[PDB]
Scaffold this active site. Structure first.
Site, PDB file in Angstrom:
ATOM      1  CB  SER A 165      -9.857  -2.333   2.796  1.00 15.62           C
ATOM      2  OG  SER A 165     -10.922  -3.875   2.732  1.00 15.62           O
ATOM      3  NE  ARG A 207      -3.513  -2.360  -0.806  1.00 19.59           N
ATOM      4  CZ  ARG A 207      -4.785  -2.446  -0.722  1.00 19.59           C
ATOM      5  NH1 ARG A 207      -6.277  -1.526  -0.663  1.00 19.59           N
ATOM      6  NH2 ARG A 207      -4.858  -3.395  -1.129  1.00 19.59           N
ATOM      7  CD  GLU A 246      -5.881   0.572   1.463  1.00 19.53           C
ATOM      8  OE1 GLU A 246      -6.918  -0.597   0.177  1.00 19.53           O
ATOM      9  OE2 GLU A 246      -5.955  -0.510   2.099  1.00 19.53           O
TER      10      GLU A 246
HETATM   11  C1  LIG Z   1     -15.539  -1.407  -3.349  1.00 22.61           C
HETATM   12  C2  LIG Z   1     -14.436  -0.906  -3.358  1.00 22.61           C
HETATM   13  C3  LIG Z   1     -13.301  -1.930  -3.929  1.00 22.61           C
HETATM   14  C4  LIG Z   1     -12.212  -1.725  -3.507  1.00 22.61           C
HETATM   15  N1  LIG Z   1     -11.305  -2.636  -3.381  1.00 22.61           N
HETATM   16  C5  LIG Z   1      -9.962  -2.112  -3.440  1.00 22.61           C
HETATM   17  C6  LIG Z   1      -9.198  -3.310  -3.493  1.00 22.61           C
HETATM   18  O1  LIG Z   1      -9.206  -4.196  -3.858  1.00 22.61           O
HETATM   19  N2  LIG Z   1      -7.542  -3.020  -3.260  1.00 22.61           N
HETATM   20  C7  LIG Z   1      -6.902  -1.315  -3.425  1.00 22.61           C
HETATM   21  O2  LIG Z   1      -5.879  -0.872  -3.616  1.00 22.61           O
HETATM   22  N3  LIG Z   1      -8.023  -0.585  -3.326  1.00 22.61           N
HETATM   23  C8  LIG Z   1      -8.764  -0.860  -3.316  1.00 22.61           C
HETATM   24  N4  LIG Z   1     -10.161   0.451  -3.021  1.00 22.61           N
HETATM   25  C9  LIG Z   1      -9.705   1.445  -2.895  1.00 22.61           C
HETATM   26  C10 LIG Z   1      -9.652   1.877  -4.183  1.00 22.61           C
HETATM   27  O3  LIG Z   1     -10.551   1.824  -5.171  1.00 22.61           O
HETATM   28  C11 LIG Z   1      -8.363   2.677  -4.699  1.00 22.61           C
HETATM   29  O4  LIG Z   1      -7.284   3.415  -4.116  1.00 22.61           O
HETATM   30  C12 LIG Z   1      -8.574   2.702  -6.580  1.00 22.61           C
HETATM   31  O5  LIG Z   1      -6.838   2.672  -7.169  1.00 22.61           O
HETATM   32  C13 LIG Z   1      -8.581   4.314  -6.023  1.00 22.61           C
HETATM   33  O6  LIG Z   1      -8.943   5.610  -7.452  1.00 22.61           O
HETATM   34  P1  LIG Z   1      -9.318   6.204  -7.745  1.00 22.61           P
HETATM   35  O7  LIG Z   1      -9.713   7.099  -9.645  1.00 22.61           O
HETATM   36  O8  LIG Z   1     -10.948   6.105  -6.905  1.00 22.61           O
HETATM   37  O9  LIG Z   1      -8.667   7.546  -6.970  1.00 22.61           O
HETATM   38  P2  LIG Z   1      -9.352   9.174  -6.211  1.00 22.61           P
HETATM   39  O10 LIG Z   1     -10.307   8.488  -5.191  1.00 22.61           O
HETATM   40  O11 LIG Z   1     -10.207   9.798  -7.044  1.00 22.61           O
HETATM   41  O12 LIG Z   1      -8.387   9.623  -5.483  1.00 22.61           O
HETATM   42  C14 LIG Z   1      -7.698   8.995  -4.128  1.00 22.61           C
HETATM   43  C15 LIG Z   1      -6.577   9.725  -3.797  1.00 22.61           C
HETATM   44  O13 LIG Z   1      -5.500   9.040  -4.794  1.00 22.61           O
HETATM   45  C16 LIG Z   1      -5.088  10.838  -5.618  1.00 22.61           C
HETATM   46  N5  LIG Z   1      -4.523  10.419  -6.920  1.00 22.61           N
HETATM   47  C17 LIG Z   1      -5.745   9.915  -8.181  1.00 22.61           C
HETATM   48  N6  LIG Z   1      -5.544   9.902  -8.701  1.00 22.61           N
HETATM   49  C18 LIG Z   1      -3.812  10.134  -8.469  1.00 22.61           C
HETATM   50  C19 LIG Z   1      -2.995  10.701  -9.892  1.00 22.61           C
HETATM   51  N7  LIG Z   1      -3.305  10.310 -11.066  1.00 22.61           N
HETATM   52  N8  LIG Z   1      -1.937  10.670  -9.080  1.00 22.61           N
HETATM   53  C20 LIG Z   1      -1.593  11.424  -7.830  1.00 22.61           C
HETATM   54  N9  LIG Z   1      -2.887  11.033  -6.933  1.00 22.61           N
HETATM   55  C21 LIG Z   1      -3.839  10.658  -7.581  1.00 22.61           C
HETATM   56  C22 LIG Z   1      -6.424  11.702  -5.221  1.00 22.61           C
HETATM   57  O14 LIG Z   1      -5.587  12.369  -4.878  1.00 22.61           O
HETATM   58  C23 LIG Z   1      -6.455  10.773  -3.916  1.00 22.61           C
HETATM   59  O15 LIG Z   1      -5.081  12.048  -2.908  1.00 22.61           O
HETATM   60  C24 LIG Z   1     -11.683  -0.328  -3.347  1.00 22.61           C
HETATM   61  C25 LIG Z   1     -12.837   0.790  -3.194  1.00 22.61           C
HETATM   62  C26 LIG Z   1     -13.895  -0.256  -2.821  1.00 22.61           C
HETATM   63  C27 LIG Z   1     -14.997   1.532  -3.018  1.00 22.61           C
HETATM   64  K   LIG Z   2      -9.406   0.660   0.476  1.00 27.41           K
END
Ligand SMILES: Cc1cc2nc3c(=O)[nH]c(=O)nc-3n(C[C@H](O)[C@H](O)[C@H](O)COP(=O)(O)OP(=O)(O)OC[C@H]3O[C@@H](n4cnc5c(N)ncnc54)[C@H](O)[C@@H]3O)c2cc1C
Ligand SMILES: [K+]
Ligand SMILES: Cc1cc2nc3c(=O)[nH]c(=O)nc-3n(C[C@H](O)[C@H](O)[C@H](O)COP(=O)(O)OP(=O)(O)OC[C@H]3O[C@@H](n4cnc5c(N)ncnc54)[C@H](O)[C@@H]3O)c2cc1C
Ligand SMILES: [K+]
EC number: 1.3.1.98
Lengths: 364, 355
Positions: B243, B167, B347
């Site tokens: 999570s 992570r 997380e």
């Molecule tokens: C139902 C569910 C299941 C999930 N399962 C998992 C799993 O199995 N494993 C796991 O790791 N995660 C999981 N997640 C967490 C999440 O989906 C991941 O962390 C995902 O990659 C976040 O993507 P996002 O584009 O939605 O980020 P956002 O929510 O839009 O942004 C999150 C953070 O990352 C930063 N960020 C986003 N894009 C960039 C970029 N391009 N450059 C720099 N910083 C950036 C943003 O500034 C913010 O700080 C889950 C979430 C949900 C809701």
């Molecule tokens: K998470």
């Protein structure tokens, strides 16, 4: 698609080719056939045919590029050679891609002149770009694993070509997954290498005391890449580590031995055994790295050894680790002298030095 | 902003998987790297500072945003191209990550299938080395194209310089924005090796076998569904940021203390995983063993509850605020600490709110 009418898609074929003049050591047999490939398509189609037809222990082809890390036994009278001459350098922003047959030093220069830092410490290393990942080529506190992102690989047994990540190459000190005890085998061929460099125009952090002193810098300071290259080229000249065809000290395959990594115990024993009447060491992740050169010299194998005679193989007058051809050396001359240095350093210190170059049809 | 779409007074809640967030002052939606870079360069030099910094956004699946942030400028990354180039897959930041997985499988490239069903963008994946089911994007990423927000400079950065770990990466104190991600995948069409016990068992296979990527995907999607970890808008167990706490990495004696106690109480073993730097515990087992069952709290009609199918997921039960999410999070964290001596780490990224 590509050279469809010709054998090996258009690769040059020659017969009865002295290999000695193609090598930096000027040692080698007359190869029965040399197949010279100027493109990735040729390297793939050439090996496909040769690997499909090869039946016996005399038919495995020798893959050959710049000829700067090869000690080839003169006994090998039934040898086919695949020669990688697939050259080509591409600039893509802060990325540099070099086909296997590019001259490595050329990649360095191109990178520096784009204002891309990271390769400057490796200036003056001979040979091809495609060879660099094989042993994680390095000098002056840098290694190609510091910047390689991926490598385009031919898996000879399946004929598959793909890109592989730096991480999957398992780089370490003078090693990778591509490095094999047997250097003929080469089951996987590097076709192309990509590097990711620093577009701000600053060198990598200076991590090597002699270079740092030479630039009047401190450890971890960054400098102008071109200035770093000029200093590195000067440091290498002093050691006979830039090719110079009139200087026999340069008729080599470079340092013949890797700096060995020893347990912390064995470093402290030598630190003690020499506290009567300061032992070179370098940081490493699983023990202490000792300077092979300091070991070789302490065991009696100094610059110019053997001094008395016209020995056809001597250690360089400028760098004890480098075996050199003084004019008429054979492979066995080189192996013989290397064995004694190796045996000798073990007798003194209880450390087995591993050879850095690749020995084809000879062993140590 | 080289043609960036600018909206005013945009509600963020419906853009988040948690359905929480403020009405933003302006949302700057960027559909190319050029727009992302133009926008962040202008905004980052203009900021005077703290609350004038723009929130970088994308998929909204890992964010907890305080509703009272009424002056918030948001840059939303919607550059969404996906390019296949032999065994290489290059995905722009705004691409939907699961579409990258599907696109790779469709071409016969293995390696992403265990990451099937994770929501959100491709760009966000390196930031916390996204993973599940025994895989992480560090297993396939070769390089990432980044904007350095402190210098305004754009460059490709290697996997290695990102310092991936569990992570984490160096992106998670230099703000950077990922613009594009490159993956090197396996053109023989075999899956990554099956390392995850639950997934192996569900396929009827052996640790280290590879399988058809599509069949791996279907297994992983069915397992995620059982845990409420694929988005399903009628299931509130999925109105989450997944999570909420990461699996903590403890010294081996902390683990051993726990494993002794659990054996004495007869409620073991303590599920655990490899780590380079000690022992990694299942945060979910700590949460439940500390008293916080699936569906906690069961009493009343709490607007924030732990998923009924996965205790680690804080869920918005209809009308939760950020304050409710953070209040439940604090209790689960404090209770785990009180019972076990282990401090769980959140997380998701928390904007204008805290544990
Ligand atoms: C139902 C569910 C299941 C999930 N399962 C998992 C799993 O199995 N494993 C796991 O790791 N995660 C999981 N997640 C967490 C999440 O989906 C991941 O962390 C995902 O990659 C976040 O993507 P996002 O584009 O939605 O980020 P956002 O929510 O839009 O942004 C999150 C953070 O990352 C930063 N960020 C986003 N894009 C960039 C970029 N391009 N450059 C720099 N910083 C950036 C943003 O500034 C913010 O700080 C889950 C979430 C949900 C809701
Ligand atoms: K998470
Ligand atoms: C004066 C001198 C100084 C030197 N200094 C240094 C130094 O500072 N640091 C350092 O690391 N090395 C040094 N070397 C060693 C040598 O220059 C490097 O190892 C160089 O990278 C070898 O490249 P080449 O193309 O000449 O390899 P070759 O000698 O042509 O090939 C050697 C081995 O590599 C394999 N190989 C070559 N190309 C490929 C490919 N494309 N795919 C798979 N396998 C391949 C070959 O089959 C063979 O197994 C020095 C050599 C000399 C003569
Ligand atoms: K060498």
């Amino acid at each position: 698609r590509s050279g469809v009418g010709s054998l090996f898609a258009g690769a040059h074929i020659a017969e009865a080719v002295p290999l000695a003049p193609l090598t930096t050591l000027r040692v080698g047999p007359i190869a029965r056939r040399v197949i010279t490939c100027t493109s990735a398509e040729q390297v793939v189609a050439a090996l496909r045919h040769l690997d499909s037809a090869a039946k016996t222990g005399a038919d495995r082809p020798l893959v050959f590029a710049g000829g700067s890390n090869l000690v080839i036994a003169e006994n090998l009278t039934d040898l086919t050679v695949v020669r990688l001459a697939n050259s080509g350098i591409t600039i893509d922003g802060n990325l540099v891609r070099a086909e296997a047959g590019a001259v490595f030093d050329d990649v360095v220069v191109r990178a520096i002149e784009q204002g891309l830092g990271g390769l400057e410490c490796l200036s003056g290393i001979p040979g091809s770009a495609g060879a660099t990942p094989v042993q994680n080529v390095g000098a002056y506190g840098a290694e190609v694993s510091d910047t390689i992102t991926r490598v385009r690989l031919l898996d000879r047994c399946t004929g598959e070509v793909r890109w592989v990540s730096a991480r999957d190459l398992r780089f370490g000190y003078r090693t990778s997954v591509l490095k094999h005890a047997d250097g003929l085998a080469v089951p996987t061929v590097v076709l192309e290498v990509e590097f990711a460099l620093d577009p701000s125009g600053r060198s990598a952090p200076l991590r090597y005391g002699e270079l740092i002193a030479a630039l009047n810098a401190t450890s971890g300071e960054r400098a102008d890449p071109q200035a770093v290259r000029e200093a590195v080229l000067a440091l290498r000249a002093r050691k006979g580590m830039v090719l110079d065809p009139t200087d026999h000290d340069t008729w080599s395959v470079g340092s013949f031995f890797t700096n060995p990594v020893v347990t912390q115990d064995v470093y402290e024993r030598l630190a003690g055994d020499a506290a009567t009447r300061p032992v070179p060491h370098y940081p490493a992740p699983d023990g202490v790295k000792l300077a092979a050169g300091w070991l070789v010299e302490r065991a009696g194998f100094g610059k110019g050894y053997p001094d008395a005679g016209a020995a056809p193989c001597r250690l360089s007058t400028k760098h004890a680790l480098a075996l050199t051809n003084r004019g008429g050396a054979t492979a066995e001359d080189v192996v013989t002298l290397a064995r004694a240095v190796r045996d000798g350093v073990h007798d003194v210190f209880g450390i087995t030095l591993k050879p850095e170059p690749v020995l084809i049809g000879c062993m140590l």
